[PDB]
Amino acid sequence: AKQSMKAREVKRVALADKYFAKRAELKAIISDVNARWNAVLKLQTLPRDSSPSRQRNRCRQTGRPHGFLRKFGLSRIKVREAAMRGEIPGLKKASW
Amino acid sequence: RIRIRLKAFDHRLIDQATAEIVETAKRTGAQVRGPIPLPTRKERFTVLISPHVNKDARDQYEIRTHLRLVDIVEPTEKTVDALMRLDLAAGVDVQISL
Amino acid sequence: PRRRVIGQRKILPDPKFGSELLAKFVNILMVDGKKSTAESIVYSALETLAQRSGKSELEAFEVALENVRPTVEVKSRRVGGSTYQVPVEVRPVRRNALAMRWIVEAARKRGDKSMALRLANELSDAAENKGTAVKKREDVHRMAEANKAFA
Amino acid sequence: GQKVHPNGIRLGIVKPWNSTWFANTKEFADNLDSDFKVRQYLTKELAKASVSRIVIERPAKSIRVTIHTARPGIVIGKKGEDVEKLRKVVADIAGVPAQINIAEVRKPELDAKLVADSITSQLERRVMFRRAMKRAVQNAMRLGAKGIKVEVSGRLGGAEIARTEWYREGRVPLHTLRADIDYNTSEAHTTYGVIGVKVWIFKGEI
Amino acid sequence: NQYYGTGRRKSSAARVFIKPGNGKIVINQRSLEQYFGRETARMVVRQPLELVDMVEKLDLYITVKGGGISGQAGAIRHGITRALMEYDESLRSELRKAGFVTRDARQVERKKVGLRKARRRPQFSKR
Amino acid sequence: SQDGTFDKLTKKEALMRTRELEKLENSLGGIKDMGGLPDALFVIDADHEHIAIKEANNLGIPVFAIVDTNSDPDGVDFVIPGNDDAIRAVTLYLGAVAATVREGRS
RNA sequence: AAGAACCUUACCUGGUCUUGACAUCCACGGAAGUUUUCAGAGAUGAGAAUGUGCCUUCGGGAACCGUGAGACAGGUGCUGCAUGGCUGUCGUCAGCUCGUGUUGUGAAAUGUUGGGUUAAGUCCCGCAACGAGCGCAACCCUUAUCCUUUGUUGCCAGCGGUCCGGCCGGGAACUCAAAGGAGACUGCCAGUGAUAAACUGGAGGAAGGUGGGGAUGACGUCAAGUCAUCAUGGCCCUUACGACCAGGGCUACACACGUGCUACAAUGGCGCAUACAAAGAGAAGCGACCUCGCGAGAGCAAGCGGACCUCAUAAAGUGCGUCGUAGUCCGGAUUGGAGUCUGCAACUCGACUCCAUGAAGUCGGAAUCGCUAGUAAUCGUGGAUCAGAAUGCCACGGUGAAUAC
Ligand SMILES: [Mg+2]
Ligand SMILES: [Mg+2]
Ligand SMILES: [Mg+2]
Ligand SMILES: [Mg+2]
Ligand SMILES: [Mg+2]
Ligand SMILES: [Mg+2]
Ligand SMILES: [Mg+2]
Ligand SMILES: [Mg+2]
Ligand SMILES: [Mg+2]
Ligand SMILES: [Mg+2]
Ligand SMILES: [Mg+2]
Ligand SMILES: [Mg+2]
Ligand SMILES: [Mg+2]
Ligand SMILES: [Mg+2]
Ligand SMILES: [Mg+2]
Ligand SMILES: [Mg+2]
Ligand SMILES: [Mg+2]
Ligand SMILES: [Mg+2]
Ligand SMILES: [Mg+2]
Ligand SMILES: [Mg+2]
Ligand SMILES: [Mg+2]
Ligand SMILES: [Mg+2]
Ligand SMILES: [Mg+2]
Ligand SMILES: [Mg+2]
Ligand SMILES: [Mg+2]
Ligand SMILES: [Mg+2]
Ligand SMILES: [Mg+2]
Ligand SMILES: [Mg+2]
Ligand SMILES: [Mg+2]
Ligand SMILES: [Mg+2]
């Protein structure tokens, strides 16, 4: 799916792990009720691509943005293909 | 005292594992409260089957997780150890903790 | 109904007076699945009617029905190539079913304060056969006998 | 497209699963991706070894991988020269210690995957599609296999209009869940485009 | 001694106990009127005991859970009839004739894909 | 039915097996042990068994038939005019043929 | 499209790159990596310190990073009238075919038609047909009754006293949980029927005539849909139709249609008190309790990978009181002010909270839709997607009809 689009996704994940989850304290430790200065808020010149809420969560095989399932990491139609051939343990057509 | 609960995706395999766990504990120990079924978890999924439009055409799947509980009330020591190195598991998850 | 003649679904009797007929009446009046609300409305109207006309609950109720029960109705049986309105006899069960439906329709159309008051007034008039429900029966009977030529 | 997948509908009745591990939601997606990575590498590498199916299971933070093949000697190679190389790469891809097993397939012409890819290879070699289908059905019935059935599709013989041209023999009770059907598919890449191949093989009733 | 019956009605399950004592009725540590004996379904609980007249001749201790007012009351009725028979099989005949012996298997129907609920289908238009 | 699996499984299919067995026995009985084509055919009525006569002619099998006044000869290699509806007449025909054929190669 | 602020995102305006954002190969140079500054909307350039981790008959080697040339890479660009795969539809309708035989010069026919019967090409009888296959039915899941087993985190009939809480000794009964079995088969009776198939009724039974629901979609039709999920023939671009960045747009608005939600009220609105569910989710998560705030929420902080803890108080209902038929104590749109939270960032363009404001609307022309029973109608609850963003979608239970001559 437009290999460049998948390239963006991998770069976004790498940047997010590099910068945030360690500089996430920047918006947590300081942006609270200390007693303040705004210097911390203005210290958001980070790449802006490190924000975890900026990744699209694409399908692992095809890479389409829509119809995604978190449990399997695949889009709806790749899930159905794998389910019919086996692959996904314990998954079978449901009736009740 | 020491509890064993097993998780698997099919009952035919979970029951075999419990029978093995119970019998070995009896052989190397005593008592055993016996396997306890505990409720089964049914996770459902619903997905469109057409690559394009056709919203009303979709399949429904489920994953059924089976659970069991053993509980040996008083390890005879010769028990606990043997409870180890007795995996013979190929799809059944065993957590050894109390 | 094309292939399969079917049976019948039984209904419980009224909890107060224990009559199937009154149980059906509350069902017809029941709106939206709120049976308890319908039961309250019916009982309030009946006790009011009994006070108005003496008698008793069930017997006073029956008197109202007997004045609105139809006996004959028209039914299109365009068989010859043109539509005719052949009068036809009404089954005993369909009689009171139509009567109860007409009474409820008239009461809802009546502009009083409470539904219980509306119902009490409507079937109290039907006891003397001056109400709107009685009027509809007259129209049905009158239309049928006009088309008496067909049978 | 109006028929259910014959393999998928029988997963809990007669047919087994191709993957037999347990996982929680945390690692369920990762295991699926790992299984996909190993299968695609392994199937690509063993293209000429006539691989029927790859079965993966993950006991105690390991990976086993069983290969059903009709030419095990080639898969194994001299002593263990080739199998060990496969194990090293599989372990690398999975990130965990990897075992490896080889199961030979008696009667290769009773396995739909081997039948389907045999037809596919012939089509890419410019063999008459009708002859390829006739041969597959004939020799499948010759060894039991009460219900062979085959089907092709798309630009048959280089035609400008696509065509299906299926062909069966015996009985193939697709509506009987109890029946043991061995359906599979394959795909050819002729010079005029793509040709799809489907095979159903029916066996004992249970 | 005690006699038992289970009873079940559309997601409700009861547990009734019969003693040959007074005519008191207790449901979940509450009186029949305290629980639902004056609101809807007041008399279904008594229905079975009306027939086989034993209203005051027997004491009832009951526990029920699941469902709603009508479902629970129906479960109580089914439990009582199953218990009475355990205290005098001779009654079956007329209990079955009354229709209380049969367990009403009328669960709610699941909703389907493409429908709004069970059978209600979305509005359709040609042109 | 005798030494096989007949008591096995449910009664109904066993009853079905008997019903079809007696159907097969009735439709094609005595012919079962023949194991081949005939080389002669004796027919009671030419018109009532014209299907059989036609098949015999196609295969080139000799046909001996008892033909009545309403029957159609020229499909029969050996025609025997006579009644074909009387019990006494047919009994005489079959008895004579059985007597004549009972002397095989001796 | 199971969820467009940025991203997604392709589209537009600008600012940029050219073996390239993504991959293999060659040579050269350097570990990788880390902390900071300037310019810039940013992409990107200019710098400075830091670190320098494994090999070596060294034109040198392993992961990694930059430079140069090429083969190449790249394309959500066109063709679903070149295709695979997948899907809708007639239609879960009962049909569609073949081998051999026979009939006809032949296209073809027979079988598959006829008498009954069935939900059914379902079954019986007859018959130049004799058999077979795909379809129907059954085998599968779930629900309705019972039995054995097991008994915690689930349960409490009989026993002890209890803080009156199954809470704690205890009990394995019961509900329940989930494995294994039984049960329903026109099987039994009567009548009808060619004595056949079958049909009507009755007994018993939790269940009676394929008990209810689901999955299951024959040969084919519509050159039906999808080249944008993916794959793929052909065609086309290659300092650009490829790649990167900021901002905007996909949310416009004289209009027309489809699908929904909320109403027009007294079978109701509002205030107080109170009863009864099922099914699910949870670790970058669900988040008790307590304190603060009118509120959305905030602070502190248990427990829980969970029959244990949390989400999480079900609402209709039922008792009291009030409103008294009004554009109203109906209805809530719209707008002003003040705020909370998510997120780098709520102007275009988020959700929710408080105060104020209080449109249309009084049951809807021609026309038209769904539904046969736990159904319609109505009342709540949960989940996927997901930082945040459901009146949509997918599921769960409560109350519960009318009518089929
Ligand atoms: Mg691509
Ligand atoms: Mg997002
Ligand atoms: Mg759970
Ligand atoms: Mg389908
Ligand atoms: Mg942008
Ligand atoms: Mg955008
Ligand atoms: Mg530009
Ligand atoms: Mg098409
Ligand atoms: Mg001919
Ligand atoms: Mg036909
Ligand atoms: Mg024909
Ligand atoms: Mg017929
Ligand atoms: Mg058939
Ligand atoms: Mg026939
Ligand atoms: Mg006590
Ligand atoms: Mg019966
Ligand atoms: Mg079927
Ligand atoms: Mg087209
Ligand atoms: Mg279409
Ligand atoms: Mg198109
Ligand atoms: Mg396009
Ligand atoms: Mg849009
Ligand atoms: Mg959620
Ligand atoms: Mg208001
Ligand atoms: Mg107005
Ligand atoms: Mg008004
Ligand atoms: Mg219907
Ligand atoms: Mg709702
Ligand atoms: Mg959400
Ligand atoms: Mg519902």
Domain boundary among D106, D129, D154: D106
D29 touches strand G (CB under 7 A): no
Contact between residue E41 and residue E63 where contact means Cβ atoms under 8 Å apart = no
Q: D197 and D155 in contact (C-beta within 8 Å)?
A: no
Going by the DSSP 8-state scheme, the letter that residue D158 receives in this structure is G
Structural biology method used: cryo-EM
Strand G at less than 7 A from CB of B40:
yes
Nearest nt (C1') from C38 Cα: G267
Does residue A19 lie within 7 Å of nucleic acid chain G, judged by its CB? Answer: no
Identify whether residues D112 and D65 lie together within a single domain.
Answer: no
Tokens 């298997």 belong to residue:
E105
DSSP β-bridge partners for residue D149: D168, D200
Chains near C (3 or more Cβ pairs under 8 Å): E
Q: Based on the domain organization, do D92 and D163 belong to the same domain?
A: no
Angstrom resolution of this structure: 2.4
Strand boundaries in chain F, DSSP class E? 41-43, 63-67, 78-81
How far is ligand 2, taken at its centre, from the CA of residue A69, in Å? Answer: 14
Residue nearest G277, CA–C1′ metric: E67
Asked if residue F66 lies in contact with residue F86, where contact means CB atoms within 8 angstroms, the answer is no
* Closest to E30 in 3D by CA, of E86, E70, E76, E71: E76
> How many angstroms away from the CA of B65 is the closest CA of chain E?
22
CA F85 to chain centroid: 17
Helical ranges in chain E per DSSP H: 32, 47-50, 69-87, 92-98
Residue F63, by phi and psi: left (phi above 0), alpha (psi -120 to 50) or beta? beta
- Put simply, whether B58 touches E (Cβ < 8 Å) is yes
User: Which D residues, 36 through 55, put their C-beta within 8 Å of a C-beta on chain A?
Assistant: 36
What's the gap in Å between C127 CA and the centre of ligand 1? 84
Structure tokens at A55: 């990744």
Closest CA to D9 of D180, D196, D199, D197: D180
| Cα A43 from Cα C22, distance rounded (Å) | 78
Residue B81, CA distances (Å) to B98, D49, D60, E90 in order: 14, 45, 18, 61
Instruction: Determine how many CB atoms are found less than 10 A away from the CB of residue D170.
Output: 14
| Joined tokens for residue D188 | 């050819």
Q: Report if residue C5 sits inside a domain.
A: no
The alpha carbon of B71 and the centre of ligand 15 are apart by a number of angstroms equal to 29
Q: How many residues appear in chain A?
A: 96
Q: Which domain holds residue E76?
A: 1-127
| Other beta carbons less than 10 A from residue A7's beta carbon | 10
Residues forming a β-bridge with D166: D151
Measure, in angstroms, how far nucleotide G281 C1' is from residue D140 CA: 51
DSSP 8-class letter at E33: I
Which residues face B94 on adjacent strands?
B6
DSSP conformational letter for D8: G
Count CA atoms within 13 Å of residue F34 on its CB side.
Answer: 10
The torsion of the CA quartet F58, F59, F63, F69, rounded to 10 degrees, works out to: -10
> Which of D74, D106, D138 is the last residue before a domain boundary?
D106
Which amino acid type is present at position D129? F
D130: left (phi over 0), alpha (psi -120 to 50) or beta: alpha
Clarify whether residues D91 and D35 are in a common domain. Answer: yes
- Cβ contacts of C12 on chain E, cutoff 8 Å: 44
Q: How many domains does chain D have?
A: 2
Please give the DSSP secondary-structure letter assigned to residue D56.
B
Largest CA distance in chain C: 55
Pairing of strands B41-48, E3-5: unpaired
Q: How far apart are CA D107 and CA D70, in angstroms?
A: 8
In this structure, are residues D188 and D125 in contact, taking their beta carbons and an 8 Å threshold? no
Domain residue limits at D42? 16-106
- What whole-number distance in Å separates Cα of residue C36 and Cα of residue C27? 10
Torsion of CA D134, D135, D136, D142, to 10 degrees: 110
**How many folded domains does chain E comprise?**
1
What are the tokens at B79? 């028990």
CB B13 within 8 A of CB B91: yes
Structural domain total, chain C: 1
> In this structure, what token pair is assigned to residue D33?
């991706």
- Chains B, C in contact, 3 or more Cβ pairs below 8 Å: no
Check which CATH number belongs to the domain holding C34 and give it.
1.10.455.10
- The residue of chain B nearest to residue D22, with distances taken between CA atoms, is B91
User: Structural domain of residue C80, as residue ranges?
Assistant: 20-147
Domain ranges of chain B: 1-98
Same domain (yes/no): D147, D60: no
The per-type count for chain A, helices as H runs and strands as E runs, is 4, 3
- How far apart are alpha carbons F17 and F11 in whole angstroms? 10
Other beta carbons within 10 Å of D71: 15
| Residue C14 within a domain | no
What are the residues facing B95 on neighbouring strands? B5
Interface test with E, best of B47, B50, B56 (most E CBs within 10 A): B56
Please answer whether residues E52 and E84 qualify as being in contact, where contact means their C-beta atoms are separated by less than 8 angstroms.
yes
Helix or strand (DSSP H, E) at E61: strand E59-65
**CA distance linking residue A94 with residue D12, whole number of Å:** 11
Report yes or no on C95 lying in a domain: yes
- DSSP letter at E91 equals G
Cβ of B7 within 8 Å of Cβ of D57? The answer is: no
Assigned token pair, F30: 């005595």
Tokens coding B54? 């056709």
Q: What percent of chain E is helix, strand and coil (3-state, nearest 5)?
A: 30, 20, 50
Angle between helices C35-53 and C20-29 (to 10 degrees): 120
If DSSP codes are grouped into helix, strand and coil, which group holds residue A92?
strand
Do E83 and E1 contact (CB within 8 A), yes or no? no
Strand-by-strand arrangement of the D66-69 sheet? D51-55, D66-69, D101-104
Outline where chain C has alpha helix (H): 20-29, 35-53, 57-68, 92-109, 115-128, 132-146
Q: Output the CATH code of domain B1-98.
A: 3.30.70.600
